[PDB]
Each structure stands twice: as structure tokens, then as C-alpha cells.
Design a protein around this ligand. Structure first.
Ligand SMILES: NC(=O)C1=CN([C@@H]2O[C@H](COP(=O)(O)OP(=O)(O)OC[C@H]3O[C@@H](n4cnc5c(N)ncnc54)[C@H](OP(=O)(O)O)[C@@H]3O)[C@@H](O)[C@H]2O)C=CC1
Ligand SMILES: [Zn+2]
Ligand SMILES: [Zn+2]
Ligand SMILES: [Zn+2]
Lengths: 365, 365
């Protein structure tokens, strides 16, 4: 076989050592007819890697677990039923890897919402020997065909990797709630991190009037460069909603704190029958209180959004290359000392705006 | 001589006496150039009246508070800028009475969502020197012509009274989330009461598969003949949600409270990016509970809907005369005792499905 029986990746097993992963060797996942095998070249650092490594939402489902789900690599092998990719193709893998392939979500462009699906890391894929999936801090990654995305040749590897998760996580609710042509529509982006910095460019490229939201004005100058048309410092202008009455056609909360948030203020600026969508929030199960009076005077709604569809990924890469929508990244050659450096900085938000791991040929044998 | 200076009505001034309304005479509101003066003939009982009188949402905003917001009356006087109604017309008044007449929502068929709007009762009208509005349990009513609705000469007044609030409040979220052509859509209505029993009829006229939701097996076939294609009792089938996985296109909640309302279970049955709209308003201290893990699996939404448009009222009355959409009422001659009898009965669920007060001349003239 052209695929080794063991992969190499930077992994942890004790959640106390979430920030200091060590190199480990683990057996591969079984390759089913609809699976694609990659040789990883780059893998962006998503914040949900820190969510899962520290076991803040759910414990670790395996020992020597490799995270990272912003993968871009080269196909070295495919299943006997794969028809969209051949050996040598440059493709990418997001935060999900397996699906039902027989439900209704998979047939109606919603495979990322399939109840029997498996994530890229820390997930038991019942279709593959109930293997706890391994992420992209690895030498190689395996995924189903509908979660493998073809990379255009004009989009470089190190810059298309953050789009495999962070990009699609903010693009999916934008196109679904604003339409691909968002001209004449006012959109709102809360929090300018790895998710927010990409949402501003995509919303701007779609033609919407973008408003960047944060507590301070520390990121005002940088958000205006990223495509925001105005800025609001929710900590400095505490009564900012007075100048935004009946304005926003949609508001996207990009992983901003759902502890110090004031939904009453953001909802007071929505149009009628609009929605407030939160992405990148940690998947915790403690129920919060909800009242209908919070959305009454605007007909508004509150909801979540996870990942996107494969057809949305294609339209995202098409729009990203058409409008030159690239994420600001900090390249970091993958290594035991380098992963601990970026994870320590990414947890504190000390990045502008996405850590991308490179030079996989130098780290793994 | 045309309009008296004081109106008569059955009012309450202490929240402890919510179910013992007294007959009192209060100074009427000023008649502004767009206002319509009615001689009330009928008025339905809506559970918002109980919540208002019981201070379940907020304290009484005035002394001697007349409630009721399903008025069918005869025009006895009009302003000078009125163009739609003349003296002697039979018309209706819902739960809203005025709006700013200068926003975009007032010109975009959303005058019910006006920021400076004033309810029919228990609300300060900034266009009438902050006069707290008075309801329809009264001799006369005053409302802006944009919130006064004409009644067809075929519809009886007592049968058309519930449509001024109960009908429009369920018709508007239905027409906006389904359209008039809801062929194939799956609708779910919770709380088969005043609004619920009408929502089953309107959703049936849309051509959509209706699934009624009750707390017990009572009102079962009563909802079947109304228009519900399916029926589930919340208190019995504790695991009903397992059979509705990815089935509902829209869920409208018309319940008065939260006892027996599992929001996480209702969100489990929605399709991806579908809305859970709640027109029902429990007491402010009562709230639904749902975990963030439920919002993310379906990508669903939770929201509210406040009343409806005037153009939607004209539409609602059109499809009413087409599919014989008529409420089930119980006419009550208005009194100090019959009101208390209806207040105590309706609070305990002893009505199918909406009380309508009649015989106003024997109580006022
Ligand atoms: N948003 C708006 O613009 C409007 C909102 N409303 C709100 O709509 C709601 C219903 O109005 P109405 O239809 O007059 O009320 P009804 O009492 O006429 O219908 C109430 C139904 O809700 C269910 N229910 C009763 N008690 C409870 C409880 N404690 N917890 C949960 N469900 C319960 C029952 O259905 P079952 O027995 O089958 O469960 C009952 O039939 C009210 O809360 C009112 O405030 C009213 C007018 C307009
Ligand atoms: Zn991610
Ligand atoms: Zn599936
Ligand atoms: Zn207005």
C-alpha cells in the first residue's frame, strides 16, 4: 500500500497538558470506498482545538489525540468509489469528515448537520470501526469524499487552510441569511478574531454594509482595512444602539463572549423578522433561560450555525478567489516547541489573525 | 353631544383584584385627526387580558384599567384626516391602536412593530400626551385609522371579534414563514386555545400538514375537525420527539405559559435553519430553558411575532371567507359578574375556545 499503517502527529492525552502536545505515532483509520487519504502540508490553528484539548465542553475520547481541522494536503490514495479526486490532487479537509450518506441532510446539502456524522478529531465514526478521528496536526489525514474540498491552484495552501473551517463557519450563515448578493443589506459582525476578521471580508465582498463590533476600539483601524464600513465600541459607546434603530438585516456573532453579552442591545437594532446567529461558541450543555419578550418588539430570532455545506465551500472559494478574500495569517513551522508557542498565544487572542502550521515535510518521517 | 367626555368600562385598579373588574367611568382619550371613535358592540376575551390584569408581565400602568382588544364596533366619529371609514361603518380594532406614522415600518406593512407604537390597553400613547390606553371592555374605543379594520357585511360581529387579535396573531407568522402556498410544509401548533384553535384552521387553509400539540388528550378530535392532520399529547407521549426527527418546517407556539413546554424537544423536530416562533407570552418571570447543544445540532431559531399588519388583516379576512375560517366562541352578556365568571373559567382552561362579550347596551346605555 502507498499509505503507511501508522500516522505521525502532535497529540496529547491529559487535558492538563492541553498546551504542550508531544509527537506520537498512531495506527491509521480504515479506508472505505468513499474515503480520501491526504499527505498534510498545512493546518490552521482553530480555536475549537483549544476547546477540545482542554476538555472544557467534552472529555477526550481517546489517548494520543491529534486536533486541528483546517487541513490542506495532497491526495495519495482514494477509495474504490471516489470519483471527485485522484492521486496528486491538492485538496482540503474541514472540521467534519464522515456522514450518513443515506439520511435526508446528506441529500439536501446539509451533511454537516447529520446526526450520525463524525468530526475531524475526537469523534467516533461508527462507519470506520468506531475509530476516534485524528485531526490535522498530523502527517496524513483521512476523510469522506463529501468533506474533502478541491483547492483551486490560484489559492495558496497556507492561506486557504483557515478557510476550511473559520471561513466556511462565517460564510455559511451569511449566504443563508443574506443571500450571495447582499448589496443593500446591512450586516453586523461581533468580535474581530480569527472568525470575525474573515467575516468582515466575506460580507464586504458580498456587497453588504458591514459594521464591526467590539468592546474597545483597539481593532477599529484593522477592521476598516478588513472590509468594515463603520465601527462600534460597545464598551466605549454604551448607548450605541440609539443610532442604529431599524438597521441590520442580519447580525453574526463570531464566537464573542456569551457571558458579558447584551442581546437586548443588539436585537434593538435589527429589522423586522431578522435573526441573530452565533458561531464558534463552545458546545456546552448547561441550559440557559429564554424569554419570548426579548424578541417581541422586533420579531427577531436567536440561533446557532455549524460549519457549512460542500456547495457553500465551493462558492466560498469561488468568491474568495474572485474578490481576493484571504485571511491574515502567522506562519509557524510545526514542531513541539512551535505548537506550544501558538497554542499559548491563540488561547489569549494574541494573533493577527490565524496561526497556520507549515513545513510538515520537516517534522514527520 | 356626539362623543361623551367620559367612557364606561369594566376596569381593574389593583392587581390582586385581577378577576373582579368594576364598572367605572373614565375620561376618554383625545380624538386626533386620524383617530376613529367606535360604539363597541362585541369584544373577545384574550389571555393577554388576564396577564395584563394579573400584572404577570408588568404592573398596571394606570388606575381603572379597561382591557380587551378584540373590538367590533360602529363608527360614531372620526378625525379630519381619516379617509378609510365613515360614520356608521362596522369595523374592528385589534391589540394595537396607534403608531408613529413616520417610520419605515409604518410604510412597509409593519406598523405593529413601530418603536413608538401604543397597545390597545395598558400602554402610554406618546401622541396623546402619554394617555395610558384603555381596552375594549368598554362603551367606546378610540384608535388610529391604520389600526381600525373594516368588517365584511357577511361576517357576524361576535364571530369576527377573535380575528382582530387571535386570528391575525397566528396568520401573520404563518403567511410570513410559509406563504399562502404552503403545499407540503409541515406546521406545528402548541397550545390549542384561542390562538391555537384558529392557527389549526389557518394552517390547514395554507395547504400544509398541521400537527396539533396539547398537554393532554383532551381537545383531540376537536382539533381534528378544525384542520389538524396530526395530534400529540405532551403529558402522555413523553418520547414523541423521537418520531419527528427532521420533520417540521415551522413551529408556532400559542401557549399561555411554560408548564409542560420543553423547548429543547420541540427544536429537536425542526429541519435545519427552521424557525421556532412563539406568539404565546408567558409571565415575564417564566422562561423556557434550552442548552446551546440543541441550537447547534439543528441550526434552528427561536423568536417571537407581535400581532400582524393591516394588509395582512385584509388578506386574513379574505382567506377566511374562502375556507370558512371561523372561531368557536361562547357569547357572554357583559357584566360585573359574567366577566368575573369568564375570567375564572378561561384561566382554568374552561373554554373551547374563546369567550366573546356581547350585549353592551344593557350594560352601558
Ligand atoms: N404575541 C402577540 O401579539 C399576542 C400574544 N398573545 C399571547 O398568546 C397566548 C395565548 O393567548 P390565548 O390563546 O388567549 O390563551 P388560551 O388560554 O386561549 O390558550 C391557551 C392554551 O395554552 C395552553 N396552556 C394553558 N396553560 C398553560 C401553561 N400553564 N403552560 C403551558 N401551556 C399552557 C393550553 O393548551 P393545551 O391545554 O392544549 O396545552 C391552552 O388552551 C397568551 O400568552 C397571550 O399573552 C395574545 C395575543 C396576541
Ligand atoms: Zn473549527
Ligand atoms: Zn446523514
Ligand atoms: Zn412608526
Amino acid at each position: 500500500k502507498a499509505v503507511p499503517d501508522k500516522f505521525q502527529g502532535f497529540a496529547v492525552s491529559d487535558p492538563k497538558n492541553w498546551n504542550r502536545p508531544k509527537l506520537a505515532s498512531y495506527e491509521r483509520k480504515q479506508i472505505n470506498p468513499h474515503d480520501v487519504v491526504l499527505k498534510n502540508e498545512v493546518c490552521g490553528l482553530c480555536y475549537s482545538d483549544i476547546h477540545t484539548l482542554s476538555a472544557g465542553w467534552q472529555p477526550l475520547q481517546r489517548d494520543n489525540l491529534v486536533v486541528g481541522h483546517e487541513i490542506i494536503g495532497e491526495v495519495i490514495a482514494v477509495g474504490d468509489e471516489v470519483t471527485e479526486f485522484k492521486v496528486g490532487d491538492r485538496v482540503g479537509i474541514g472540521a467534519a469528515s464522515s456522514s450518513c450518506r443515506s439520511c435526508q441532510r446528506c441529500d439536501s446539502d446539509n451533511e454537516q448537520y447529520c446526526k450520525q456524522g463524525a468530526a475531524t478529531y475526537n469523534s467516533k465514526d461508527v462507519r470506520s470501526n468506531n475509530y476516534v478521528t485524528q485531526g490535522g496536526y498530523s502527517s496524513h489525514s483521512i476523510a469522506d469524499e463529501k468533506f474533502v474540498f478541491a483547492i483551486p491552484e490560484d489559492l495558496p495552501s497556507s492561506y486557504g487552510a483557515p478557510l476550511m473551517c473559520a471561513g466556511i463557519t462565517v460564510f455559511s450563515p451569511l449566504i443563508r441569511n443574506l443571500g450571495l448578493d447582499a448589496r443593500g443589506k446591512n450586516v453586523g459582525i461581533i468580535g474581530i478574531g480569527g472568525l470575525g476578521h474573515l467575516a468582515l471580508q466575506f460580507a464586504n465582498a458580498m456587497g453588504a454594509n458591514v459594521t464591526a463590533f467590539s468592546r474597545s476600539s483597539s481593532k477599529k483601524e484593522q477592521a476598516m482595512k478588513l472590509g468594515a464600513h463603520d465601527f462600534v465600541a460597545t464598551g466605549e459607546d454604551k448607548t450605541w444602539y440609539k443610532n442604529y434603530d431599524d438597521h441590520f438585516d442580519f447580525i453574526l456573532n463570531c464566537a464573542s463572549g456569551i457571558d458579558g453579552l447584551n442581546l437586548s442591545e443588539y436585537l434593538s437594532t435589527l429589522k423586522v423578522d431578522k435573526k441573530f446567529v452565533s458561531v464558534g461558541l463552545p458546545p456546552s450543555e448547561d441550559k440557559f433561560e429564554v424569554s419570548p419578550f426579548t424578541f417581541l418588539q422586533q420579531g427577531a430570532s436567536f440561533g446557532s450555525s455549524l460549519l457549512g455545506s460542500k456547495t457553500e465551500v465551493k462558492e466560498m472559494l469561488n468568491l474568495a478567489a474572485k474578490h481576493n478574500v484571504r485571511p491574515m495569517i502567522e506562519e509557524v513551522p510545526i514542531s513541539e516547541e512551535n505548537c506550544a508557542k501558538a497554542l499559548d498565544r491563540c488561547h489569549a487572542g494574541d494573533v493577527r489573525y490565524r496561526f497556520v502550521f507549515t513545513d510538515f515535510d520537516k517534522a514527520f518521517k
